[PDB]
Amino acid sequence: GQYQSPRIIEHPTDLVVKKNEPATLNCKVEGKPEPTIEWFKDGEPVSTNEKKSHRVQFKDGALFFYRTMQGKKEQDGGEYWCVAKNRVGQAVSRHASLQIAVLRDDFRVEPKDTRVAKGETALLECGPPKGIPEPTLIWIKDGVPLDDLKAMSFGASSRVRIVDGGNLLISNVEPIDEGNYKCIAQNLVGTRESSYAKLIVQ
Numbered sequence: 689g690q691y692q693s694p695r696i697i698e699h700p701t702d703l704v705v706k707k708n709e710p711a712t713l714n715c716k717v718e719g720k721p722e723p724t725i726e727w728f729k730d731g732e733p734v735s736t737n738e739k740k741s742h743r744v745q746f747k748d749g750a751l752f753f754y755r756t757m758q759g760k761k762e763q764d765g766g767e768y769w770c771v772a773k774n775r776v777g778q779a780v781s782r783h784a785s786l787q788i789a790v791l792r793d794d795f796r797v798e799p800k801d802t803r804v805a806k807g808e809t810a811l812l813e814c815g816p817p818k819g820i821p822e823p824t825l826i827w828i829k830d831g832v833p834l835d836d837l838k839a840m841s842f843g844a845s846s847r848v849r850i851v852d853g854g855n856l857l858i859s860n861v862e863p864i865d866e867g868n869y870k871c872i873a874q875n876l877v878g879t880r881e882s883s884y885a886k887l888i889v890q
Contacts, residue, residue: 700784
C-alpha cells in the first residue's frame with residue numbers, strides 16, 4: 689500500500705585507492721516514503737555537500753570523494769557505513785573500509801659515494817621514504833637487483849646484508865663488492881629510487 693521500512697539493496701564495499709584519487713562508497717536503498725541517507729565514519733557522522741567538506745552525497749545515496757585526502761589536515765581512510773531512515777523505521781548498512789595508499793618521494797637518507805679499504809667493512813645508506821602500505825626496500829648493483837646475485841653467490845650470505853630497515857652492510861669487502869649501488873622503495877602507489885653511489889674497493 690504505502691509505507692515500507694528502509695531496505696538496503698547494496699551496501700558499501702571495501703575500497704583501496706591512492707592519495708588524491710577519487711573514491712566512491714555505495715548505499716542503494718528503498719523505502720516508502722523515500723528514506724533519507726546519512727553517512728558515518730568510525731562512529732561519527734560525515735558532513736557531505738557543504739562548502740566545508742570535500743565529500744559529496746549523490747542522490748542515489750553514494751558517498752563521493754573527488755579528491756581523496758590522507759594528510760595532516762584531512763584523513764579520509766576509515767570505517768564507513770550509511771543509515772536509511774523514513775517514518776516507518778530505519779536500516780543500517782554493513783560496514784566498509786576505505787584505505788588510502790601513499791608513498792612520499794623523499795628518502796630519509798640516500799647512499800653517497802663511498803671508497804672503502806679492502807677486507808674492511810662498508811655501510812651504504814638508505815632511509816626509504818615513509819609510506820602506507822609499508823613500502824619495501826631492495827638494493828641494486830650496476831643494473832641488476834642485489835638478491836639476483838646473492839642467488840648465484842656461494843659463500844657467506846651473512847656478509848652483504850640489509851639492516852636498520854634500509855642500510856646495506858658489507859663486511860669483508862672484495863674487488864667484486866665494488867660498483868654502483870642504488871636502493872628502491874616500493875608499495876601500491878609506485879616506486880622510489882635513491883640516486884646511485886659508487887663503492888670503490890682498495
